[PDB]
Every structure is written in structure tokens, then in C-alpha cells.
Amino acid sequence: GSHSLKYFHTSVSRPGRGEPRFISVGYVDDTQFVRFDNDAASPRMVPRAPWMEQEGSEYWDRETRSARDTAQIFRVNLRTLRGYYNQSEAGSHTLQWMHGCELGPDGRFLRGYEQFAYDGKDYLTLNEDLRSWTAVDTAAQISEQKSNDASEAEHQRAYLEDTCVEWLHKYLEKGKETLLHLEPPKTHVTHHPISDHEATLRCWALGFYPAEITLTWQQDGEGHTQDTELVETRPAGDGTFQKWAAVVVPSGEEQRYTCHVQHEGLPEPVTLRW
């Protein structure tokens, strides 16, 4: 299976209250493992996963310096983009940065991505070849030319193809007992009569990892059902996820309906009834 190392950077300018708020988080697959928040006197990078607490001061000092430098650069970038769009300093604006690398099933580099956003919209995107950029408007084309001036696509390609892959291997080894552990969903069906003629069947999937999952209601063992209420997968708060699927069925015919659960932790799909 594939694994990924992802970072998410958010910078929000504060019109009358000082320097911009800056927050960075890192994820290995669906597990957050570090966090940086500049809302402190001397902000630092801290662990957010138990397997990260074994890192020495060399790691945390380096990540703290990198994160502090990124916050300063993003403060500069927020001032620059404000000038590009001729926006007042009285308004709050948001700059986002996401990047990451994915490994193939052999554990080698598969692909990488890097993307910037301004005020909730795409701004500058590193193309799939990791050698060119895509700008959304004339303002981002100035950023693109700046990136070309610095050979930025080459520097980021070097990070995504080498540094990101090497350290993802390090993280996967440090947290192997949980990162490389598939947790199957614990499933059951609940029954809620709506009237004398109809009832709700809700198929639950609880405590699974990773978050990717598929819940489908099937009638008479034949493919798909028409009116299924599906909720977005949600975090339980303990590292695992939740989801359910509901269907309204005629009372007395509940045995015709089967819920099918697909998940990486299941060697074969699971089928259940009420």
C-alpha cells in the first residue's frame, strides 16, 4: 500500500493586532504527528503523536527554526500579495501552502505535489512534472516569474523526491506499530421505525483506520440502492474514524437489505443485516 507525508500551512493577517497568525501541521497518512503555532512568545514545533516523543532536541530545534522561518516568509508573502491586488491593510487575508509526497507499493517515490492558495482560491500550483508552475492570474504570474528566477521548481522537486521520501521512511519506522496497522471497522445495524409501514436501517462503521471506507446498502443481493443517506467520514477523536449509511425500508421487508463494508483492514468485504 501507499503512504504519504503531508504538511498544511495557514497564515492569516491580523489588521490591528500585530503579526499574522501562522499554523503548520504535518500528517503521515491520516495521522497528525507535529504542529507549529506562532501564537506564542517563542513558538516551537511539538509532537502530536506518541511515537514522535522519542525525537531528540536536534530534531525539534531544527523543525522549530524551519517553521519560524516559514512564518516570517509568509508574513512577507502576505504583504506582497496585498500589493499585487491593491488591497487595503485593514482587511484580513489568508495564505495557504500544502505539499507532500506519496510512496508506491514498493516503498519508492510515486508522486509529489505543492500548492498555494490566497483567500480560499488557487494561486500558484506546482505542475505534475514538478518542473513548471501554473498561475491563476497576472498576480500569480509575477510569483511564477519569481519562482523561475530562483529555480524554485527544482528546489521543491528535490525536497519532494528526496527529503520528503527519506523522512517519510523514518516516520513510518518510528510509528510502525500504529502507522502500519490497519484497523477494521466494527459494524452493526440499528433499526428506527418511522411509522407503521416504514423503518430506518442505519449501518454503522466505527473505530477504523485509515479513513477511506465504502458503505453501500444492497437489496436482494443486487448491486446498489436508490435512497441512501450517507454522512461524511468523521474523526472519533482517538485516531480512528466513523461513518454510517441509512436507508428507509418497508416494515417487514428488512431482511431484503444488506449493508456492504469495504475497508483495507478487511481481507474481504463485510456483509451485515439487521
Binding site: 531544527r62 524551519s66 517553521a67 516559514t70 516568509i73 495564505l95 498555494f116 494561486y123 530562483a150 524554485e152
Partner: peptide, 9 residues
């Protein structure tokens, strides 16, 4: 780990 140097826009 984090990228060493953030890009300038």
C-alpha cells in the same frame, strides 16, 4: 521534516 526554505511569492 519541513522544507528548509519556503518559497517567496
Amino acid at each position: 521534516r519541513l522544507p528548509a526554505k519556503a518559497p517567496l511569492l
